[PDB]
Each structure stands twice: as C-alpha cells, then as structure tokens.
Design an enzyme around this catalytic site. Sequence first.
Site: not given
Lengths: 249, 249
Positions: B10, B12, B94, B96, B166, B172, B212
């Site tokens: 991905n 992004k 996703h 996001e 996910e 983050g 990650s």
Amino acid sequence: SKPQPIAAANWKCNGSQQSLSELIDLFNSTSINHDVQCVVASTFVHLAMTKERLSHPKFVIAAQNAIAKSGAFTGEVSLPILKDFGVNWIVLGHSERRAYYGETNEIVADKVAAAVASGFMVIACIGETLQERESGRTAVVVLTQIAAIAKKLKKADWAKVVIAYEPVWAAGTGKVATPQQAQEAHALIRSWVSSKIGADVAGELRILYGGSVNGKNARTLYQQRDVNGFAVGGASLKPEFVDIIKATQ
Amino acid sequence: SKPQPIAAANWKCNGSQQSLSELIDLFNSTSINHDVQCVVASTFVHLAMTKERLSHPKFVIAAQNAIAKSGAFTGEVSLPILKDFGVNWIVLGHSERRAYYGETNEIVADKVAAAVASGFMVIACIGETLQERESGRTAVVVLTQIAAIAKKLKKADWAKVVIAYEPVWAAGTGKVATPQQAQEAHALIRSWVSSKIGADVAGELRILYGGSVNGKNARTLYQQRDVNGFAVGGASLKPEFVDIIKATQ
C-alpha cells in the site's frame, strides 16, 4: 473589456480509454482561432493517456481534486504528485465535493491556497443550493464561500485563481438558469472582489459559468458582461464541447 | 495448512515517477520461489506507469479506493473506470479513509460488495483504534466491521475477498503490536467467519497483518497460525518490501 476566456471540460468521474481517446482526437483536430485557454480535467486514472494523446496548443490538462501533501492518506492524490506528473491546473471546491466529501468553505480555502503556493492554476468553485437561493441567501452564501478562499490568499495569488460559479440551485432540480440570472451572479461576485480585494484584481479575474451549457446557449451566456468562459459538465464529454469553445469568441 | 499468502504494497499517497520506477524495477528483478500473490496498490495517477512497467508474474496492480458507479462525483474514481483500465484488485475500507473521508462500516460494505460484483479481488480492511482497544472494545469493533461487510455478501463472494487487520491502535500512537496480539486479532476474525459464514470459507480466507513490519518481525508474524501475509504501509515504498515478501515462504 474581458480578460482571456477559459473553456474548461470537467469530465467528472467518467470516461473509458476508448471514449476519451476519441474525444481527445476531436479536440486535437479542432481549429481554434481566438485567444482562449482550454482545459481538460480528467479523472486521476486518465491523466497519463490525456498527457500523451492531447496535443492541441490551446489545451492544458487539469486534475479534479487533490490534497495538500503526500503521506498516509490512502486513496488520495496530493499536489506534489500532480506537479511531478506535469499537471499544473486543478479544479477545487466543486459542489459535489462540498456536498459529498466533507469540503467546507475552510477546507476548500486551504486546498486553493496550497495549490497556488505549489504553482498551480486553480479553478475554484462556488455556488448556492436551491434552498439557499429560494431563502434569499444567494449573496451571503456565495460571498462567504469566496471570502473564505480570499482569507487564505495574498493579493499576488489572484493571478493564479479562476472562479467558477456553479448554480447548484438549477442542476438536477428541474430548473434552467437564464443568461440574466448567470450575469447577476457573476456581477455580484466581481463587485465583491472589486470592493474587498481590489478593482485591478477584479478586472483581471476570470469568472466562469458552471451551469448546464450547450452549443446553443453558450454564445448568449458569453455575451454577458461578467462571463469569462465556462466550466462545463456533461457537455464536455461530447462533440458539442467544441461549440462551447467557439462560443468564447 | 494455510492458503496462498499475499504480500501487498500500500503505497498510500506517495511516489514520484522516478522513485516508483526504481521500485518497480527492483520488484521485476526479484526472484520469488514460493507461491505468493504480490500486490502493488499505487495512487490512481501512477496506475498507467505501474501497468506498463511491472512485469513480475507474481505481481498484480491494485487501486487504493473507488466509488461504485461512474457519474457526477468530481474528483473520485469509479470501479467501471478501474475495470476498463485493467485494474482487478482494490484496497477498500482503509483506516485512513474510515477516519478522514467519511467511510462508515456500511459505506465500506457497500463498496466491497460493488467491487466484488464487478469482478474485483478486494482487500477489505478492518481494525480498532487505540481508544477502542483501551476501552475493551477490540472484539466488538472488529466483529462489527466484518459483520457489516458480510451483510452485503453471499457465501460464494468470499472467494474474491481478503481481510486485512490494521492495528490502528499502533499506527503512530507510540504502541507496538506483538505477534501474540496480532494472532489473537486474526484468530478472532477467523472464528467469526467460521461460525457465521462457514468453516470452508474460513479455512480459505487470507487474513493479512496490516501493522508496521520489517523483514525480521514479518518472519515472526508469519509463524502465527492465522496470519496469511501482509498489507504493508511505509516499508512498501522501500527495498525492504522484498524481505516482507520473503517472510511469507
């Protein structure tokens, strides 16, 4: 007297490889004798084939949207990616994005400022809905839209900005805007720019009509005092877009 | 044992023509000795370049988003446009887009069903935020998300579906998921699919880890019973992605 006109094709979320290739071929073979900037705003997917196949000297290519910067924004396209891709025009704040995809007056303003800062020519869209117009709120709604944009721009940035007025109130609702209704809206916008930003800016600013246009009504619309061209929806997917271009003579 | 693994890149909202060209060249030159489906999800802009240049037989191209239908949706890309363009894989839902761009469980579900109906292989993304996990709602959220997708699908449709978990709670935030925490999430999803859709479907379903990863921990993660590969974010813009592919052997 008027600044250089613009005939912009907003293809929206439309097109196939074959159909847009044939459209581009018609555009390439069209003789355009006067000074007009022509713009093709394709979907992101179709920018590569449009860059390759479109060759008319009076046409540039535009995106229909972007976000300000690259990063963890799955599904989106950023200004630096478009710049790297050779795309230097962009449509921002379209009524569909304001309605469907969360673009407030302030979100549009930040995108416009970011695009001008990156070196884009920007067609920034404003326009009132049918509820807003009937309720007598056309002026406050449309001028609040452009004021939100202006609050994020330097005076120098207006050289890179084009305004498209979208009469959302007429589209799909069964209405059709007269050239006098269009001219009334454009004159209102230009008067605000003249008073609040400067007569010099207002005289140079292109204000494009963004309602339903065809080859017939475009000439009569362009005759109006404050109409500097068109940001065309459905007709821009058809051969009659050529006649809309010629209407800016 | 396990169905065929997937290693998805991905990218992004990232990439230049040059930098992605160099990445594709690396992928094309990589020898992959085991059965794995590799996927490259570029921005819409970069789809043409990836189509032309990617040649490795174990790689396919994917979009990062779509809407169901062509039409008056300025800035968006539709499934018919992607299909016409030769793109047959897609990432949907996703985190996001669920966070930034209005995608509810139901909107994700409708997009997944439309893509499946159109012939796409779909990587459908689910997963809970830090606030959801810390309030004890990991299972509620994950199961609610996949149940909404399942609601719009028939049993046969699952052959076209891939799930990506996910750990948004680790994106983050300062937190790091352990292989045991990933496996618990994956096992929960597997358990629900087996009980609500079918044990046959559950055994064939690919559930990808979407947190990650690097080469080392991807190898450990792939040891987990219910991990069938990776939906990679930032490592996938790096040569290290080849090590993630290797971790599925």
